[PDB]
């Protein structure tokens, strides 16, 4: 690949105390880092963006269990391409949506708050989709498809499409189900129901699992982020 292919790697802008233990949600590190690295190694240019130009990390995603090895080295090295890209992160409205050929929604629970109304990021997604690009997200990232009509059809972009994303049971295990129900924050299954999509549930909540429906590619969880990016490449190229 070349820098003529530009990936819009979307991050959530929501960064607030969220969990019962008082920790914050925000961007789940490896859901940005893994796809960044997959696309970088492929040769694409990657532009990070959030709806405000600001972000913070999900506190649960920076712990040794989830951030270790070469990932952590990249994260800690201020001169890594990943960190250069974070410094170059832009507010979505400051970008030209026509510049991008792939849209990839990184997540973390923060996305539940902003992605459904992130109209500038959403416009980049539909612009990408409507010119024959690939639109993708991992984990709660598919919240980007909530309230999102495809200009070419006048119907929800994922109407009649298959997607996956973070499981309902996963929300129980993380202790955020009640928080979500009180905030009218929709699980990805619920997003599919709202939009007339079909949610495909992985066998287990932590499985490395993706779904490709034409040029829509989704994955379940942090464990699926690499595969989601790889399967974006598969869907995007002929190769």
XYZ file of C-alpha atoms in Angstrom:
239
model
C 0.000 0.000 0.000
C 0.881 3.699 -0.213
C -0.026 7.003 1.426
C -2.537 7.525 -1.344
C -4.698 5.293 0.856
C -5.548 7.281 3.952
C -7.184 5.635 6.917
C -9.362 7.729 9.191
C -8.714 6.099 12.529
C -11.489 7.475 14.759
C -11.084 7.752 18.533
C -13.759 8.571 21.080
C -13.620 12.068 22.596
C -15.519 11.063 25.760
C -13.233 10.686 28.792
C -15.006 10.627 32.159
C -15.297 8.561 35.319
C -17.490 5.652 34.267
C -16.723 2.363 36.042
C -17.948 1.364 39.519
C -14.327 1.481 40.740
C -14.247 5.192 39.868
C -11.912 4.796 36.888
C -12.393 6.628 33.587
C -13.402 5.341 30.204
C -12.050 6.725 26.949
C -9.988 5.189 24.145
C -9.053 1.532 24.671
C -5.361 1.735 23.834
C -4.816 -1.349 21.688
C -7.998 -0.711 19.678
C -6.179 2.308 18.301
C -2.627 0.934 18.488
C -3.151 -2.472 16.853
C -5.057 -1.188 13.830
C -2.623 1.720 13.494
C 0.245 -0.758 13.314
C -1.518 -3.140 10.892
C -2.310 -0.300 8.499
C 1.151 1.250 8.949
C 2.893 -2.019 8.103
C 0.614 -2.318 5.073
C 1.899 1.059 3.851
C -1.190 3.215 4.265
C -1.256 6.694 5.759
C -3.211 6.925 8.987
C -4.951 10.048 10.303
C -6.218 9.847 13.869
C -9.319 11.958 14.609
C -11.929 12.497 17.267
C -15.080 14.597 17.119
C -13.481 17.325 19.266
C -9.774 16.796 18.603
C -9.409 15.704 22.235
C -9.354 12.289 23.902
C -8.186 10.354 26.940
C -7.303 6.731 27.572
C -9.665 4.230 29.128
C -7.958 3.577 32.507
C -8.727 -0.153 32.307
C -6.848 -0.375 28.970
C -3.444 0.892 30.205
C -2.862 -1.848 32.801
C -0.074 -4.403 32.315
C -2.534 -7.141 31.284
C -3.764 -5.126 28.286
C -0.676 -3.052 27.496
C 2.580 -4.965 27.429
C 5.394 -6.295 25.249
C 6.127 -4.444 22.019
C 2.771 -2.605 22.262
C 3.911 -0.967 25.502
C 7.307 -0.139 24.035
C 5.563 1.653 21.178
C 3.203 3.344 23.617
C 6.044 4.574 25.872
C 8.401 5.656 23.098
C 7.469 9.305 22.486
C 9.112 9.109 19.049
C 7.173 6.065 17.854
C 5.069 6.516 14.719
C 1.998 5.832 16.902
C 2.898 8.717 19.244
C 3.714 11.016 16.348
C 0.248 10.193 15.025
C -1.357 10.976 18.396
C 0.365 14.365 18.324
C -1.086 14.824 14.818
C -4.626 13.856 15.889
C -7.210 16.250 14.451
C -10.737 17.414 15.116
C -12.908 15.672 12.484
C -14.476 18.919 11.229
C -10.991 20.233 10.353
C -10.547 17.391 7.829
C -11.777 16.912 4.259
C -13.959 13.804 4.311
C -13.094 13.067 0.640
C -9.430 12.514 1.556
C -10.068 9.123 3.224
C -10.478 5.635 1.760
C -10.978 3.569 4.943
C -12.804 4.505 8.135
C -11.857 2.534 11.252
C -13.656 3.141 14.552
C -11.479 2.342 17.534
C -13.423 2.211 20.742
C -13.603 1.850 24.435
C -16.902 2.522 26.183
C -16.444 6.272 25.596
C -17.727 5.721 22.047
C -21.216 4.998 23.444
C -21.408 8.654 24.429
C -20.138 10.468 21.340
C -20.091 8.220 18.274
C -23.895 8.166 17.765
C -23.959 11.964 17.411
C -20.473 12.446 15.994
C -21.785 13.860 12.758
C -18.395 14.900 11.330
C -16.806 11.461 11.885
C -20.037 9.951 10.569
C -19.781 12.092 7.431
C -16.245 10.771 6.867
C -17.625 7.225 7.251
C -20.432 7.731 4.718
C -18.114 9.528 2.288
C -15.711 6.582 2.498
C -18.535 4.076 2.031
C -20.216 5.876 -0.846
C -17.070 5.998 -2.993
C -16.332 2.288 -2.593
C -14.125 2.390 0.499
C -14.359 0.208 3.599
C -16.048 1.281 6.833
C -15.128 -0.645 9.960
C -15.139 -0.607 13.737
C -14.204 -2.757 16.699
C -15.793 -3.363 20.113
C -18.212 -0.458 20.837
C -16.980 1.250 17.679
C -20.090 0.196 15.746
C -21.932 2.846 17.754
C -20.742 5.006 14.835
C -23.515 3.386 12.797
C -26.196 4.470 15.238
C -28.355 7.201 13.642
C -26.315 6.892 10.448
C -28.165 6.975 7.161
C -26.357 6.182 3.903
C -26.948 9.115 1.540
C -27.077 6.691 -1.393
C -30.067 4.775 -0.015
C -31.908 7.075 2.418
C -31.790 4.153 4.860
C -29.477 3.266 7.727
C -26.046 2.425 6.365
C -26.137 -0.980 8.100
C -29.773 -1.787 7.334
C -29.878 -5.399 6.136
C -26.157 -5.881 6.913
C -24.439 -8.220 9.361
C -22.273 -6.759 12.095
C -20.702 -7.792 15.343
C -19.306 -5.864 18.312
C -18.981 -5.997 22.077
C -21.269 -8.606 23.616
C -24.110 -8.027 26.072
C -22.611 -10.559 28.469
C -19.298 -8.675 28.285
C -21.099 -5.643 29.711
C -22.187 -7.722 32.714
C -18.679 -9.016 33.253
C -17.331 -5.448 33.236
C -20.109 -4.325 35.567
C -21.479 -1.621 33.255
C -24.837 -3.018 32.142
C -26.906 -0.944 34.610
C -24.858 2.171 33.860
C -25.606 1.688 30.165
C -29.340 1.093 30.620
C -29.693 4.195 32.784
C -27.814 6.332 30.246
C -29.750 5.006 27.256
C -26.440 3.735 25.959
C -27.168 1.000 23.434
C -25.243 -2.241 23.243
C -24.063 -3.143 19.790
C -26.810 -5.762 19.518
C -29.292 -2.969 20.322
C -27.617 -0.724 17.718
C -28.153 -3.447 15.133
C -31.802 -3.797 16.226
C -32.341 -0.035 15.992
C -30.831 0.206 12.513
C -32.368 -2.980 11.042
C -29.034 -4.810 10.951
C -28.328 -8.377 12.037
C -26.029 -8.733 15.029
C -23.786 -11.810 14.872
C -22.765 -12.940 18.364
C -19.359 -14.592 18.863
C -19.367 -17.920 20.713
C -17.726 -16.203 23.675
C -17.243 -12.588 24.700
C -13.431 -12.610 24.421
C -13.157 -14.459 21.100
C -11.027 -13.124 18.255
C -13.955 -12.657 15.879
C -14.927 -10.444 12.978
C -17.784 -10.142 10.510
C -17.391 -8.927 6.931
C -20.438 -7.860 4.969
C -19.111 -6.528 1.692
C -17.265 -3.338 2.631
C -18.431 -3.288 6.249
C -16.065 -5.007 8.676
C -16.608 -5.254 12.412
C -14.926 -6.983 15.365
C -15.977 -7.850 18.887
C -13.392 -6.645 21.368
C -9.783 -5.662 22.055
C -8.771 -9.241 21.235
C -10.221 -8.785 17.714
C -8.606 -5.489 16.770
C -5.723 -6.926 14.735
C -8.046 -9.253 12.829
C -10.531 -6.423 12.194
C -7.768 -4.365 10.562
C -6.484 -7.350 8.588
C -10.021 -8.125 7.403
C -10.488 -4.477 6.408
C -7.449 -4.872 4.132
C -8.944 -8.108 2.761
C -12.265 -6.403 1.973
C -10.633 -3.245 0.564
C -8.043 -4.809 -1.768
C -8.648 -7.487 -4.414
C -5.517 -8.273 -3.478
